[PDB]
């Protein structure tokens, strides 16, 4: 029914180990560029 079986599970392991590197790294890449915005401090200074 499914000769690809062991080939697909092999790619799956890679997919799992690859995502396991990339997801933290892509996250670390976003977290960086938003770090400017995430730590910005507002002050309002109107007259009187």
């Amino acid at each position: 029914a499914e000769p690809e079986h062991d080939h697909r599970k092999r790619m799956g392991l890679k997919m799992l180990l690859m995502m396991g590197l990339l997801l933290p790294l892509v996250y670390a890449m976003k977290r960086h560029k938003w770090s400017v915005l995430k730590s910005r401090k507002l002050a309002y200074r109107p007259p009187k």
Partner: protein, 61 residues
């Protein structure tokens, strides 16, 4: 050596977007080897005798 090495990396390899790109490309070739090695070998070790790569010796020539 253990602190001033991210530094050494950056000067030599990361400043120039050429050497940056060269590093990622040179670095990717070496990674594709080491990964398709290691992970295939991880995948080997989790079956150990389910696969025709191990059976091979049974039916000779």
């Amino acid at each position: 050596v253990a602190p001033t090495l991210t530094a050494r990396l950056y000067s030599l390899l990361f400043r120039r977007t050429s050497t940056f790109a060269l590093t990622i490309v040179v670095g990717a070739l070496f990674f594709e080897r080491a990964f398709d090695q290691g992970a295939d070998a991880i995948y080997e070790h989790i079956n150990e005798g389910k696969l025709w790569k191990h059976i091979k010796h049974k039916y000779e020539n």
